């Protein structure tokens, strides 16, 4: 019936961490290789994703108890949750009005077609669009949005994690907060938490499809050369 | 006293190869990560150099007898001559008027300071500037400029070359052409060929200094992550 001085603390850190790592103007975008509308969008989106990974790392490092994990694990979690966290955070820029990520003028408004010119199929882009919409329809409070990201990241069931007990512990602690927060601060949240955990499962397959279509790219040098070192390292197999 | 039907042929291929691989407008430059004036120029120049390597490869593949070399050698030569060929071809964009490479508007005019913001020292940039000037003062015919590049590339004394006999053969054949061409087509070229071979030696040390300052970068991830896969592969040690 009332948040605790430690649960308030975690929410405060997470919300700040997100503000510290997510520009709502997308001003850094000019720094990317320009968009071209084969695979004309690959350089830009690769830049976009590489940049995002950095932001996702900055966020993670501020998640409570994350720093205390082994370098090995922090990497295991980041590598496997990378793309998911990116899909989650991109919801702030997605919009139902025109079914696209609107990160700026005509140049930075990303529609499903643009991503096609990055080597991904409309087939596996549909679930993404569908996922963004449902997430958008949840009208998540910043706290829940922020908590969902941190919970997603601290998933214990990722290829590579060692101490999956300390990680499961951290995660379902976060989960408590989300439930607690929703239950006492979000009117009509009766069903929300379940719906939110639904998203995580959605993300897994969304992650899966991507990791496949990415291997294609990563194997064709004419395309892999368009990627950034960070991307290649994060979505690479070399552990 | 008169060029031969085979020496004319080689000059024709080389000159075309260069036209095919060197835009005099530098229109592709917009595609690079924008210039910022630490290490603000690194992303742009890295893009610039990565792009150039591709052009240098396109040129090499058209050098007579180059394709017939082993993939192993073509790589051995390209890796070791990469930066030199780039320094040579950049002379077309360098200008004594303002002692810089002028590849476009204010954004693409590269002065020595800009390169400092890419992790290189003014100390080892001086010989480059000095080298460009002397080369510029030679007022090379396109043929000689083009021949010098091909000769530089086909140097037999590079770390990695196997069949250094077939390579030395190709090179001093090219050399003949340069001498022959200069001697019958370039009035006042009495001394030129020697001066041109001087440049090659200059290039070696210019290459050396760079390979050092590059290892620095390549070892600091915050910087190496700013490079492109192609650059990392070409200036890498992994043979």
């Amino acid at each position: 019936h009332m948040l605790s001085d430690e649960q308030m603390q975690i929410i405060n850190s997470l919300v700040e961490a997100h503000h510290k790592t997510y520009d709502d103007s997308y001003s850094d975008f000019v720094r990317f290789r320009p968009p071209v509308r084969r695979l004309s969008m690959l350089p830009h989106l690769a830049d976009l994703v590489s940049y995002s990974i950095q932001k996702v790392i900055g966020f993670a490092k501020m998640i409570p108890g994350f720093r205390d994990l082994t370098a090995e694990d922090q990497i295991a979690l980041l590598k496997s949750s990378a793309i998911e966290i990116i899909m989650l955070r991109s919801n702030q820029s997605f919009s139902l009005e025109d079914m696209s990520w609107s990160c700026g003028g005509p140049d930075f408004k990303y529609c499903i077609n643009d991503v096609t010119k990055a080597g991904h199929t409309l087939e596996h882009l549909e679930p993404l669009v569908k996922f963004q919409v449902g997430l958008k329809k949840l009208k998540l409070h910043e706290e829940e949005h922020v908590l969902l990201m941190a919970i997603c990241l601290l998933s214990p069931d990722r290829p590579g994690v060692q101490d999956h007990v300390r990680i499961e512990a951290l995660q379902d602690r976060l989960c408590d907060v989300l439930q607690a927060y929703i239950r006492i601060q979000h009117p009509g949240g009766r069903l929300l938490y379940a719906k939110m955990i639904q998203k995580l499962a959605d993300l897994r397959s969304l992650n899966e499809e991507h990791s496949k279509q990415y291997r294609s790219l990563s194997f064709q040098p004419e395309h892999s050369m368009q990627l950034t070192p960070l991307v290649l390292e994060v979505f690479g197999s070399e552990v | 006293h008169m060029l031969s039907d085979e020496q004319m042929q080689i000059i024709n291929s080389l000159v075309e190869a260069h036209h095919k691989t060197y835009d005099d407008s530098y229109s592709d430059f917009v595609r690079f990560r924008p210039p910022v004036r630490r290490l603000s120029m690194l992303p742009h120049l890295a893009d610039l150099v990565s792009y150039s390597i591709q052009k240098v490869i396109g040129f090499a593949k058209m050098i007579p007898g180059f394709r017939d070399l082993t993939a192993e050698d073509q790589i051995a030569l390209l890796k070791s001559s990469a930066i030199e060929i780039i320094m040579l071809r950049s002379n077309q964009s360098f200008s004594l008027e303002d002692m810089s490479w002028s590849c476009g508007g204010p954004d693409f005019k590269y002065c020595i300071n800009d390169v400092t913001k890419a992790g290189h020292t003014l100390e080892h940039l001086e010989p480059l500037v000095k080298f460009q000037v002397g080369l510029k003062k030679l007022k090379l015919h396109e043929e000689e400029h083009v021949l010098l590049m091909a000769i530089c590339l086909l140097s037999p004394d590079r770390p990695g070359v196997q069949d250094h006999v077939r390579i030395e053969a190709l090179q001093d054949r090219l050399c003949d052409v340069l001498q022959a061409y200069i001697r019958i087509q370039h009035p006042g070229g009495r001394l030129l060929y020697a001066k041109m071979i001087q440049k090659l030696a200059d290039l070696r040390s210019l290459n050396e200094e760079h390979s050092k300052q590059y290892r620095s970068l390549s070892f600091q991830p915050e910087h190496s992550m700013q490079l492109t896969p192609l650059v990392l592969e070409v200036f890498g040690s992994e043979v």
């Binding site: 070192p229 | 991830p221 190496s224």
Partner: peptide, 10 residues
């Protein structure tokens, strides 16, 4: 390996 990720994780 993961030179870059290590670096970025302070």
């Amino acid at each position: 390996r993961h030179k870059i990720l290590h670096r970025l994780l302070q």
